[PDB]
Every structure is written in C-alpha cells, then in structure tokens.
Amino acid sequence: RIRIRLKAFDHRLIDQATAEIVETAKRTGAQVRGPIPLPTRKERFTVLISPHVNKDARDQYEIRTHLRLVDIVEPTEKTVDALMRLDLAAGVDVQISL
Amino acid sequence: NQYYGTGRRKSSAARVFIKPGNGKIVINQRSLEQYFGRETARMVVRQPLELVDMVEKLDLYITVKGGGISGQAGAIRHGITRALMEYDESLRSELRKAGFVTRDARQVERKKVGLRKARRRPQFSKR
Amino acid sequence: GQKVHPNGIRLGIVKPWNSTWFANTKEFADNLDSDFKVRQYLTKELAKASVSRIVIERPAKSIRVTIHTARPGIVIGKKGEDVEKLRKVVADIAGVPAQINIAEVRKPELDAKLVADSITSQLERRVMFRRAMKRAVQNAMRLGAKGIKVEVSGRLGGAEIARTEWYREGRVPLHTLRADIDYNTSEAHTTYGVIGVKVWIFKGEI
Amino acid sequence: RSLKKGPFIDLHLLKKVEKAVESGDKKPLRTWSRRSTIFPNMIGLTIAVHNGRQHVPVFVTDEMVGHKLGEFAPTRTYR
Amino acid sequence: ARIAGINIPDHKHAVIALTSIYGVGKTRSKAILAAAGIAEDVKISELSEGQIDTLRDEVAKFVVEGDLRREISMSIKRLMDLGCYRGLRHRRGLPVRGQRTKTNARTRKGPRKP
Amino acid sequence: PRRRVIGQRKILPDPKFGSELLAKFVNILMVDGKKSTAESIVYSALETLAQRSGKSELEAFEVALENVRPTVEVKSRRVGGSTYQVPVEVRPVRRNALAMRWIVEAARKRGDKSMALRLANELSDAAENKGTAVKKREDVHRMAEANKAFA
Amino acid sequence: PRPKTLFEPGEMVRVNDGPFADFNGVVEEVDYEKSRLKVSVSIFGRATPVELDFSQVEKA
Amino acid sequence: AKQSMKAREVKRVALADKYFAKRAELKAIISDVNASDEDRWNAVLKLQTLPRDSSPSRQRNRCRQTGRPHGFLRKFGLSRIKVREAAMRGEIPGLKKASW
RNA sequence: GGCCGGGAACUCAAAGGAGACUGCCAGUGAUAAACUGGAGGAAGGUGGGGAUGACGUCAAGUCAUCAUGGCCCUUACGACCAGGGCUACACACGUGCUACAAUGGCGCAUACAAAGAGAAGCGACCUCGCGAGAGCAAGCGGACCUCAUAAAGUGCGUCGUAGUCCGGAUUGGAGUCUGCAACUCGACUCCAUGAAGUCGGAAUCGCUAGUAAUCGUGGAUCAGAAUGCCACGGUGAAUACGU
C-alpha cells in the first residue's frame, strides 16, 4: 500500500536507482513487492530554425520522460528509517507516498 | 487442446486459444452470424483451414482488440497460424509454403517534415 | 545552412548532458532562469580561468555547478576565499544554496574550448593567425588527440570580404556518432568587428 | 453577441448622458471610445465620435438598443 | 395543393412539402407535421384536405412567404434609414462581414466579366 | 522500369472462392480505398447476371471478357523525327487487365438509376459485343488497322 | 477540524512521528474524508510527498 | 527586439499581479447569474478605475532575454531559437534530438 | 462494472541483449568480384522508415532572434498612453478547404484506434434548454480522474437523374462562450435563404504500397480565436510492356 514513485527522464540513470532502493530496503526491512514500471513518456516538439524565413526547417527534439514505481509492501519502521534523507539518483524527483 | 497463438496485425492485439472436439466460431463473446456473419471476409477468420477439417472438429474462442476491423480480421488468421502448434508437424510446413505465419509489416509510414502524408509532395511547377 | 553540431546529436549516448535534473513544466521556468545569467556572471570572471564545461545539476530544492577548469589556483585565488565569493553572489540570486564543484582537468591543451579562445586571447593584437593556430594544432596533435579540424572566422587579415578556411589533421567524425569529438565557439569584439572561431578536436571511440 | 447579462459603457460616457437631460442643446459633445454602446436613455444626442482623425457627428434613434457608436462613426476612407 | 396561397406540394414527401415554403427550414418543417401527427414519409396522395385546414391554423402562427419578404426588406430599409456603416455597405456591392474580401468575396462582386 | 525490372505483386483473391482472376476486377472497380462497400455492389452486380442468364459465374463472365479481348493496341515508338503510332501485339496475359479499364469507366458513363444499375446493363451488353464499351474498343482497331505497317 | 486537522493547501506543517519526525513541509493536498494530509518533506533536497495524520504532524 | 518592449513586460507583470492574479472575485464572479439590478453593473464600474493594462488579457508570453513576440513555446518560456540554444549546448535536461 | 478473490500461464508495460552476414546450396561467370533463384526464419539481400546534408556554387536570405565596424537621431528618427490600421478592393496569381450526389443527403440500430495534453486549469453525475451550453459539483498537479459519445462501415429502409431531399456561400433575426472591450473586429450553435456549378480548354502537380485515395481525431499557440501545421488512427488499388 506504500508507494515509492520515481520521476526522471532517462532509463540509463534510473537503472541504478531501482537497484539502490530495493537492496538497502532488503537489509533493513526486506518487505517489497518489486519495481513495477510505467509507460515511457515522450514530449516531441518541431521548431523553426531559420531566423526570419522559410517554413521548412523543422528539427525534431524531445524531452524524454520515464517513471518507475517501487511499491514496498509493508509500512516498515526500518526501510523508511534508513532510507529517509537518502537517495543515490542525483537530479531526480523522489515521491515517497506513505 | 490448450495451447497458444499470437497475432498483432496493424496495432490490433489478439489472444488466441485453440479447442478441439466441439464446433463453434465465437469471437470475444460474439456469435458467428451476428457480429461478422454479414461483414465481408468471414472466410479470413477460417482462411488456411481448407486442407484440414475443423468446422465439425475444432471450436475457436478468439479475443482480438485494438487496431481496426480488418486488422482484427487479419489478426485472427495471423494468430491462428501461431496457434496451429498441436499438429504443427502437419501444419508449420504448409503455413510457410502458404506464407501464413508471416507478420506482413505494412506499417504506419511516419510523417516526414514537408512530405504531406509522409510521401506526398506539395504542387511545384516550373515557377 | 550547413554544419550540424555532432555535440547535440551525441549528448548522453557517449557524452553526458550539460544539465541534468528533473522539473515540471511549471517549475521549468525558475530552474532555467538561474542557469543562464549566473553562467553569464561565471563567464565574466572565470574567462581568464581556462574553463572547459559548466554542467549545472540542480536537484529539487538544491543546486550544484560542476565547473571544469585547469587553473583553479586563480579560481580559489588564495585560501579558497574567492570560491565563497562565487557562492555569496549566487545564493541570494536563486534563493537556494548553490554549491560549487570546481572539478579540474589534468590536461588543458586537449580541450575544444581552450583552443578556441587561445587565438581569441591573442586576436586583439594582430597576429598571423596560421602560426598561432598551427602551434596549438600541432601541440594538440602530438599529445594524443588523433584528429583535428580547426576554424577561424571574421575578416581575417584586416580584410573586408568574407573569408573562412580550415586546417585538417586526422579523423573528423560527422557521419559516425560512435566516435568522440568536441566543439566550442567564442567571439572577439574589438575596434574592427567580431573575429570568430570554431574547432573540431577528435579524441577517440568506444 | 457579447452577453445577455450586460453591455458596457465608459463612466465618462455615462455622466455625459446625465448632464444631457438636465441642461440641453448647447454644443456637439466629444468622446473617444467607439466601443461604448447606446442605451435608450440617450435619445437625440448629437455626439461627435473620434474616428482616429477627427470626430464624426452622430444622431440617436431608439432602434440603437444593442448597437454601437462606430456603426455611425466609421474609419475606412475609400476614394 | 393550397399552402401559403401559390406554393405547391409537388408530388413528393410531405416532409419536403413544407420546406419548399419560403419562411421555414430545418426543424420547423419537422415540427409542423409532428404537431399534425402525420408521418413524414407520406405523400400528397395521402395528405388530403381534411388535414390541410388543420395545417393552415398550424402555419397561422408564424410569418409566411410574402409576409417574410416584407420585414426583411423593412429591416434593411431601416438599415438604409440609419445610413450607417451597415447602412452604406449593402448597396455598394461589397460583402459586410469580417470577410477576407480582397479576393474571394464573389457573392456581392458577382461574376468576373468586366 | 529503367534497369530494376520488377514484376507485379500478388492479387488479394476473392473471399468467396480462391480466384486470382476475379480479384483484378475488384481492385480497379474499387475507388478511394473503400473495398468493403464496393465489393458488395460488385457482388450484387454478379447477382444481376446470374439470374439474367443462370448458367455459371466463372464462365458466364469470362465469355463477356474473352469476346472483347483486344488482340492489339497503339503506342508511340521512336524510329525517326516525329510522332507515329505503332500497332502492338498484346500478351494474352495483358489483354485481360487492360480490357477491364474500358468496362470500369462504362460503369461511370450512361447513368441509368444507380451505381449497381449503372454498371448492370453496361456489363450486360458487353457479353454480346454490341455494347458501347465494346464500341470504343474497335474504333481503336479502326485506327490500329489503318496503319498496320510493322512486321 | 482544528489547526493540524484543518490542514490547508500550501500551509506548512510539522512531522513528529515515523522517520519523517523532526521535519517540516507543506500540505499540497488535504483529505478530511480520509483524515490524511498530503505533505512532502525536504529529505536530501528532493521534496518527499508523504501522507501524515493530523496528530502525526503539527500545524506550522 | 527592443528594450522598450521588454520594458513593457516588467510594467505588465507588476500591476497585473497587484490585482488580477490574486483578486479574481471582483473581476470574474461578481457578474454571474444574479439579479439584473445595476449593483453588479456598479461592480464593473469599479473595474474601470483600475489600469486596463493590468488585465490578464494583456499577457504576452515573451522571450525573457530578447523579447520576441511571435514564435513562442510555453514549455520553456523561451523563443523558438532559444530551445535550440539549449538543445545544442545542453542547458536543458533530457532535451535530445528526436531521432525517430 | 476484471467488480471482489485468485494467477505469473498471457496481451500489455519497460530494460540489457540475443536475431542477418550473401552464412549455405547450384547454375553462370576470368579459381575473384557478382546477379539472382533453393532453404529455414519474425524478416533476404542498405528487413520499412528516420536521423547525419562531403568539397563547394548561388560573393543565394536575414542587421527584424542575438552579437557587432562605421553612420546619423541623441529637446529626436528615442520614450508614454488613449483610437484606427495590419482585418482595406474593379482586377491577377499561389497554396489549402468545400460541392458539383445515389459508391448519396437523411433517421434509427450497432462495430472498432493509437499518439498525447492537463492546475489563478482540464472537467465525471445531476437539473433544465429544440439546440449550443449555463448553474452546481467528484476526481485529478495524471496507464487510476477528465478531455473522450472517434467517423466513414454495416442493417433496415426511404427517394429515382432534377440544379435537384445535391451544395453551402450570402444575408436578416435571436443567442451560447471568452474577456476591460466582439461597431469597425472573434468562434460556434440555432432559426431563415438557398445563387455558381452536372468533371473544367492549352498547359501542368503529386505518387512505387498501407504509398494513392477517403473518413475521423489530438496537440503546439492561447483570456478567445484553424479549412493552417505538426503528429496519430481507420479502409484500402492501378500500373512501371520499355530508355
């Protein structure tokens, strides 16, 4: 019932983030349902590049988005205790919905 | 008996499952004559099965969603060719010989910039 | 209209991004606002400090700036008191404690930015630009970097008409995204115009 | 075509009407806002209304209940 | 046979017997025969005189062909009596809208003969 | 083509019976990507002939096309300095698909009441070779026999 | 409904129970029906939106 | 484009967020479905004394550096070349060229 | 009501990789290169597509994204605010949207997508309004909530080639929503009207397969304002004899 949502862009940096928070919870609480992912999220935007003319130069960029949900099974007073002010992933948005 | 198949024709996802003995053609709780018994290509739900005998011997409870009408009508023959696995010794050889296991990726052609419907060029004369 | 950056097509797959932190669309603004104008004030003072890249990674309710120079002895100045002077002029601007990472390079002369402002640091007084480049180009060639194509722009030689030329030495990947090549650009505004510079220095591969 | 719950008049276009009933025909009045409407309490008003160059004299009828000054104070000049 | 004086149901459905009348269109033509209770797929061969006087009181409520001809002309004559923007803009032969009238305004400009 | 000589891909056959012959008429009679509506009125057009005659369905229509197979047409071949039309011996295999183009426009012209009927009498008169769709065929043969020069 | 129980949007609160004890934060969302306050704690910088009861946190 | 048009927005953001960012009942709800006496007409009479520049209809989402009116995007708050100005030098996280 | 258990089979969800290279077989050909058939496979020859635009030409465009040498204004060409104009009109072209009907206009019954947006905002039910939508109000800073009832299709019919029950411009009347403000100058819904035109000359534009074609929708902008545009999805060809 306790949810740990993690919100970022790339799967190449969140992949060490789902490893650090299931194993450090295992040493203290050992009560988790496993990481259940979310569909990858795409924000594509075509933009004009020529400074004053020519509505043909549209280059596609995208700010990509990814979400992964940990969902520990039991409200443990040891998992949250050891992993309160602790998150390896840098430049990340953690959502510890208790 | 209780064995699996898979068809994914044009963004349409299927869940195929084979049954022997009884004969009925049910397509996701829908009957044979009501849902598709007047729609065109009611044979494409049974297409490869002329050489075998199934109408009296095999019943199929088929569930396909998504995509389109013909895509759900195409996945049902694409899914059954991954679901002819019980007599696959007498089925896998012909279904490549009749090319029936193939996916036929006539995909969505993505919109290139400028190319109107991704291949269509705007009208440009000599001036 | 030519010459796309191999930088922007290769960020992340081989070379890390110049900013990495999450934000919502609503706090996309205030995170963005701090980044430009203090790097503006960073490039005002650490212009002579020989810096290579400034990646700013500011987590939710936090900010860290990874300054990548080669002479931090003039950045810390003496006893590191000037590092806090970078910190006191940024804390009351963004309103968040902005910690500063001056993570240096051991090798200054194998950097795309330093060779760019090298000619620009000596462009003010009229130099034969070829030998000025040639020196740095040869130095960067023999020091291990296997490829270089180096650019200058403006009105070279006190000229009036348009002039640009490049000096090819080694490998230049622009159709192979796997290999490792950087690029930067600065400018020289003086009593005769803007005399500009690009570079493409190749490091390696997988 | 805006709202049944209310039209709009400027407050300066408001008290020009209240001074009208008490005093009377002296001079053609002057305004700027062509987007203030006409209510039935302004009959016979000789308002000259700014087109953007000068002021164009307008007379009031009582069909003008949801109708603006600028139908009678135009701007576009053609030949 | 005799609706609004001269206008005739020409041998067709009773639903399109009413829409042929000037002054009545999409949902009033459905409203007339539904208030008459007669089905829409029926013909003038079935519609007899015993309902057409029941039709006459039903159409006695609104404005009719020659009658609607007057007030729309009366309104634009009042618009001419205003002599205003929309007063002038009719008789010039130019369309009165927020129309891109610079090229494609051919309703008031007419055919491209001279 | 220029050098990359390609054939033609396969023809999606009739669902009623596995005939590649019938489908090549279904594809051209279809317009605008709508095969589902166009096949039924094609199938109803099969039910215009199979009760008018009552003989077959694979032979009752083949006789309507085999009696109107143009043994030759015209095209422009370069042998000098201008425009000349040369009589070209069509393949049996090519007589078929270029005959149906004459017939599918016959469904367009001569509007009788409706598309099912607008195709109906036009496919009917083609079986006896006196139809107007047959008429535009041999006036090309009037042109084709007027220059029979090449052997 | 009183102070902590009457949690408002954006109102800062105080946590004194669980690992989030000794921490302050704001209640972005409130749930009187579920008797739960949606407040996040500034843990290692990133706000840690967690649900705390009125008695689990104090009005600040 | 011009420092004066960028001098408009600092005046625009100021007096609008004096009234029309926080005080919304006096400008929106007070002429909803109530009686058509002239007291809610008196409510919009007070709406004339305030600056009409302070309305949120004035809102021109501008480039924060150079102030370009057309060709805008709200997801960065920037002009249409500034999103490339961070795409090619990496000043925005996750902003990758869509290689699809 | 997959709604409540149960399950880890399975669709889907998302990661690190496995998978394709003319590897193998035969003819031909200079034992080479190499084309293309035979095989199995998910795919067969760069499997479909995108991204990457060499040296360079037009000394092609932009000083109005920004920078910047000279030049001039620097009691003005700089600055401020309240209206108009950019929305002007005999005529011409360009690129788009709509019909010129029956494979159709219309009414009822019923079928099936992927992509994505969302907080001084997006809006489930409920009450009424011909309708459009107003008031009231959950959920939801999001695979859970909403937007969002996708249409052509199909079935029963209904009408029979007429400027027509085709078509939608124009214009008058009455309003819905936005917002200081809808005259000049918004959009939409509805009431009323219903002109041109029944495949368009020389000439010329697109296209090698889910392409063509037709039907439907979301999004960026944004108080409001798309037939534009960038993306998605539905059904589904002809023909490349030859240079």
From Swiss-Prot, chain A:
Q: Name one GO molecular function term.
A: transcription antitermination factor activity, RNA binding
Q: Which GO terms describe its biological process?
A: cytoplasmic translation; regulation of DNA-templated transcription elongation; ribosome biogenesis; transcription antitermination
InterPro entries according to UniProt: Ribosomal_uS10 (IPR001848), Ribosomal_uS10_CS (IPR018268), Ribosomal_uS10_dom (IPR027486), Ribosomal_uS10_dom_sf (IPR036838)
- What Gene Ontology cellular component terms go with this record? cytoplasm; cytosol; cytosolic small ribosomal subunit; small ribosomal subunit; transcription elongation factor complex
Q: Which Pfam families match?
A: Ribosomal_S10 (PF00338)
> In the record, which residues are listed under signal peptide?
none
Give the keywords, sorted. Answer: Ribonucleoprotein, Ribosomal protein, Ribosome biogenesis, RNA-binding, Transcription, Transcription antitermination, Transcription regulation
Q: Which PROSITE patterns match?
A: RIBOSOMAL_S10
Family matches, as SMART domains: Ribosomal_S10 (SM01403)
Q: Which domain of life is it from?
A: Bacteria
State the similarity comment.
Answer: Belongs to the universal ribosomal protein uS10 family.
PANTHER family per record: 30S RIBOSOMAL PROTEIN S10 FAMILY MEMBER
Q: HAMAP family of this UniProt entry?
A: Ribosomal_uS10
User: How does it associate, per the subunit comment?
Assistant: Part of the 30S ribosomal subunit. Can also form a heterodimer with the transcription antitermination protein NusB. Binding of S10 to NusB is mutually exclusive with its incorporation into the ribosome. The rRNA transcription and antitermination complex (rrnTAC) consists of RNAP, NusA, NusB, NusE (this protein), NusG, SubB, ribosomal protein S4, DNA and precursor rRNA; S4 is more flexible than other subunits.
Q: What is this protein called?
A: Small ribosomal subunit protein uS10
Q: Which gene encodes it?
A: rpsJ
From Swiss-Prot, chain F:
Q: Which domain of life is it from?
A: Bacteria
Q: Name one GO biological process term.
A: cytoplasmic translation
Q: Name one GO cellular component term.
A: membrane
Keyword set, alphabetical order: Ribonucleoprotein, Ribosomal protein, RNA-binding, rRNA-binding, tRNA-binding
Q: Which GO terms describe its molecular function?
A: mRNA binding; rRNA binding; structural constituent of ribosome; tRNA binding
| Family statement drawn from the similarity comment of this UniProt entry | Belongs to the universal ribosomal protein uS7 family.
Describe the subunit structure: Part of the 30S ribosomal subunit. Contacts proteins S9 and S11. Cross-links to IF3 and the P and E site tRNAs.
Q: What does this protein do?
A: One of the primary rRNA binding proteins, it binds directly to 16S rRNA where it nucleates assembly of the head domain of the 30S subunit. Is located at the subunit interface close to the decoding center, where it has been shown to contact mRNA. Has been shown to contact tRNA in both the P and E sites; it probably blocks exit of the E site tRNA. Protein S7 is also a translational repressor protein; it regulates the expression of the str operon members to different degrees by binding to its mRNA.
| Other noteworthy facts | The strain K12 sequence is shown. Has been predicted to contact the N-terminal domain of IF-3 based on footprint studies; exactly how IF-3 interacts with the 30S subunit is controversial.
Protein name per the record: Small ribosomal subunit protein uS7
Task: State the species of origin.
Answer: Escherichia coli (strain K12)
Ranked from the top, the taxonomy reads: Bacteria, Pseudomonadati, Pseudomonadota, Gammaproteobacteria, Enterobacterales
What range of the intact protein is shown?
A: 2 to 152 of 179
UniProtKB/Swiss-Prot annotation, chain G:
Q: Which Gene Ontology terms of cellular component type are present?
A: cytosol; transcription elongation factor complex
Please give a single GO biological process term from the UniProt record: ribosome biogenesis
List, for all copies, the residue spans of the domain called KOW.
Answer: 9-40
Q: Which keywords annotate this record? A: Ribosome biogenesis, Transcription, Transcription antitermination, Transcription regulation, Transcription termination
UniProt comment concerning the protein's domains: The N-terminal domain interacts with RNAP and the C-terminal domain binds either to Rho or to RpsJ (NusE). These domains are separated by a flexible linker.
Family per similarity comment: Belongs to the NusG family.
Subunit arrangement?
Answer: Monomer. Interacts with the transcription termination factor Rho and with RNAP. One NusG monomer forms a stable complex with a Rho hexamer. Binds directly, but weakly, to the core enzyme of RNAP. Also interacts with RpsJ (NusE). The rRNA transcription and antitermination complex (rrnTAC) consists of RNAP, NusA, NusB, NusE (rpsJ), NusG, SubB, ribosomal protein S4, DNA and precursor rRNA; S4 is more flexible than other subunits.
This protein's name: Transcription termination/antitermination protein NusG
Q: Which organism is it from?
A: Escherichia coli (strain K12)
Taxonomically, what lineage is the organism?
Bacteria, Pseudomonadati, Pseudomonadota, Gammaproteobacteria, Enterobacterales
Question: What is the name of the gene encoding this protein?
Answer: nusG
Full-protein interval shown: 122 to 181 of 181
UniProtKB/Swiss-Prot annotation, chain H:
For this protein, the record's SUPFAM superfamilies field holds: Glucocorticoid receptor-like (DNA-binding domain) (SSF57716)
- Gene3D superfamilies, alphabetically? 1.10.287.1480
A Pfam family matched in the record: Ribosomal_S14
**Keywords noted in UniProt:** Ribonucleoprotein, Ribosomal protein
Instruction: Quote the cellular component terms of the Gene Ontology held in the record.
Output: cytoplasm; cytosolic small ribosomal subunit; small ribosomal subunit
In the record, biological process GO terms are:
cytoplasmic translation; ribosomal small subunit assembly; translation
User: What GO molecular function annotations does the UniProt record carry, in alphabetical order?
Assistant: rRNA binding; structural constituent of ribosome; tRNA binding
| Entry-linked InterPro entries | Ribosomal_uS14, Ribosomal_uS14_bac/plastid, Ribosomal_uS14_CS
Where, by residue number, does the polypeptide cross the bilayer?
Answer: none
Where is the signal peptide, in residue numbers?
A: none
- Similarity comment text for this entry: Belongs to the universal ribosomal protein uS14 family.
**What PANTHER family does the record tag this protein with?**
30S RIBOSOMAL PROTEIN S14, SMALL RIBOSOMAL SUBUNIT PROTEIN US14M
Q: Which NCBIfam families match?
A: PRK08881.1
Function as written in the Swiss-Prot or TrEMBL entry:
Binds 16S rRNA, required for the assembly of 30S particles and may also be responsible for determining the conformation of the 16S rRNA at the A site.
Q: How does it assemble?
A: Part of the 30S ribosomal subunit. Contacts proteins S3 and S10.
Q: What is this protein called?
A: Small ribosomal subunit protein uS14
The major lineage groups are: Bacteria, Pseudomonadati, Pseudomonadota, Gammaproteobacteria, Enterobacterales
Gene expressing this chain = rpsN
